[PDB]
């Protein structure tokens, strides 16, 4: 059941944009890594004294990359006067997020008819504001509320390319990778308690919750299921430690953990990131053991052939399976030093209408076909 | 004129170490765009509970990476009790060095006979301690000595494989790139005073001096002149702005300049790191005119053939000539977000005795010919 219940009208995922270090590093390993574009930069070169920011895009998907520059730089800029061009910056602000979580997504940001009007309606239910609405070139509203730990739940409105004050990429610079990404399709949230979480977020936005190893979560929705944030938390006293709770510690505390990139040809993409893994990409998690392949069969033998699930067991790829539909998915390793942040791949199939979002949820039956696997494969 | 001065035995640069804020990102950056191998790591999966180190290697040229991980895995821990492989780094130091410089080299590393008795006698001789001689594992002995800014200059000596607590990364993880680079060549620091940096340094290591547009240089060096440390400071009042006081300003004072690596084929190593420049490697400064290679038959025409000059053309390679020996050469575009460190290819050809240090000069006659064929190439 959809209540739809929204508070304000949600359109689609927009950007996420990652706090680091130094930019250009972060935005060139992960372009070569996931085949994404160069496509728009505000930085010195554009006016900015305050950031560099650099934005990567595959399809609709939208990544962006920014640090900050010596304070010395803008040290008599005012905001009034600020050559910033994401007004919400603040250099303490940044260097403080990466110096307590490391790298890792600082603002999950979704497009929205009127920024100015979510925001207000998010605090007057409970939102914490981040940096109230500013409108850019009299054309973009950007405003921001918490979302959980240091991640910001960004809002951006257009009147009618990315945000004013960023150029277009030098075509000689912008090489046209492309290993077959498209959208954002979920963005997922680590907590110490999920119920807390999912009352404050589900509290401000008017989302609705969408249909034994390691964590509890649940996942809130927009009205027509497109924007999709899952949460989770940790369960302690296990065998194996939870690795929500690894997070936490090695993230120092709430965060980002992964984001979900669908693929239009999954095969595709991992035969494109699995080449680049050694020279530079992402490293994928261990594959798991030919077992599970095999038990493949009876579970989806009427949505892969033969070779599209042998497919699967040469990339590593996972399978699970809804009442609606069917999801192929992949984790990579964590992105940078910490154990925290890491990207899931998918591709779903079914739940046609367009695709209803979620289609075929978001694995977790894959928690216990993994271990049964794990025994099963012992022999 | 060389009086071989050294005050201790030096032997070769052994390694450069960057503080980073992410390791990882920068590492796998820098081994797609260099052609570098991963062949070492210190890290959580090594024990180590205070710094992600990882080491990449082409020919003998080291490149070490490292960040530190949140303080509270290891506050648990005193010096005496350390699970960190470099007992010279400190959580507060590297975040402060990255905040203050953003990516940088923290470390110039040569190996000498006895790092203890170096360190001894360069304080002795003026040096500002950093970190007292330690030995590591019986095996290893590493001290640290300020060299300029934030910089150290890193005595390491071994009684007899990168360093004790640092695992050789599996051979899956390590793909074998190579485009041709083979080791260090020189280190250049920006300062903003020449005089009194030359007098500092060459006073305690007793190094020697070494054989109108932006700055002042000279070179230290060692007894064989291998281990190579030019030094610039700015020109002020210049027609252009001296990029040594651009660097200065945007490193927040004194720091490393750039990296020499010498090729064993240049041409090879630019044409490999120019097809990735778009892919997430470096980019090169902007060409010289046609007529500087239009003159470079007058200058280098009993060096370089026509299709080996015509190949400097196409690649952007710059050329000059010593008395003793002909040095092409090429610049990077800055290595990261700020307008700061650069790294230069090389490659000498000449002083055969093996080849003598420093063969062909630095390429400041490159200033002047730069110049001559811009005004040239208006026509
Ligand atoms: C537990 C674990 C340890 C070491 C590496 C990997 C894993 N690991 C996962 O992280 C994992 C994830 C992260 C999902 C997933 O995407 C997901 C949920 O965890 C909760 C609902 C929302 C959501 O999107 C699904 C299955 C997973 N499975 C099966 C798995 O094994
Ligand atoms: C000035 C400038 C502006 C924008 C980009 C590039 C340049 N630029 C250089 O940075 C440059 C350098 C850095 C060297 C060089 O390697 C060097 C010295 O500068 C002093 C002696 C020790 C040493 O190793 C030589 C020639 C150079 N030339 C010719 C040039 O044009
Ligand atoms: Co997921
Ligand atoms: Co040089």
Chains 1, 2 share one sequence.
Not at 31 to 55: C, I, P, Q
Not at 60 to 88: H, N, Q, V
Request: hydrophobic residues 35%.
């Amino acid at each position: 059941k959809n209540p739809k219940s929204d508070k304000f009208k949600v359109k689609r995922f927009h950007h996420i944009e990652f706090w680091c270090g130094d930019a250009t590093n972060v935005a060139r390993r992960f372009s070569w890594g996931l085949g994404m574009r160069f496509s728009a930069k505000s930085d010195l070169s554009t006016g900015n004294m305050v950031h560099a920011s650099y934005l990567l895009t595959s399809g609709d998907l939208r990544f962006l990359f920014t640090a900050p520059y010596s304070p010395s730089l803008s040290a008599g800029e005012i905001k009034p006067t600020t050559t910033a061009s994401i007004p919400s910056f603040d250099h303490g602000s940044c260097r403080s997020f990466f110096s307590s979580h490391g790298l890792g997504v600082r603002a999950v940001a979704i497009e929205v008819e009127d920024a100015e009007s979510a925001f207000s309606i998010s605090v007057a239910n409970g939102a914490i504001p981040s940096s109230p609405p500013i409108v850019l070139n009299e054309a973009v509203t950007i405003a921001e509320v918490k979302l959980y730990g240091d991640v910001v739940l960004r809002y951006v409105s257009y009147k009618a390319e990315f945000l004013p004050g960023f150029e277009r990429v030098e075509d000689a610079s912008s090489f046209p990778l492309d290993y077959g990404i498209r959208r954002l399709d979920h963005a997922v949230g680590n907590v110490p308690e999920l119920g807390p979480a999912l009352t404050y977020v589900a509290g401000f936005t008017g989302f609705h919750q969408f249909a034994e190893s390691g964590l509890n979560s649940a996942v809130l929705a927009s009205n027509d299921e497109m924007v999709l944030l899952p949460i989770n938390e940790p369960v302690h006293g296990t065998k194996r430690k939870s690795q929500i709770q690894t997070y936490l510690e090695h993230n120092e505390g709430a965060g980002l953990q992964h984001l979900a990139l669908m693929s239009e040809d999954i095969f595709r993409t991992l035969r494109e990131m699995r080449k680049r893994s050694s020279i530079g990409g992402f490293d994928f998690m261990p594959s798991p053991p030919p077992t599970y392949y095999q038990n493949l069969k009876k579970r989806v033998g009427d949505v892969l052939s033969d070779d599209q699930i042998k497919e699967c067991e040469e990339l590593g790829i996972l399978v699970d399976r809804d009442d609606q539909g069917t999801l192929l998915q992949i984790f990579t390793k964590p992105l940078g030093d910490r154990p925290t942040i890491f990207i899931e791949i998918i591709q779903r199939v079914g739940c046609m209408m367009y695709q209803s979002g979620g289609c075929g949820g978001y694995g977790k039956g894959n928690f216990s076909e993994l271990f049964k696997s794990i025994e099963e494969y012992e022999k």
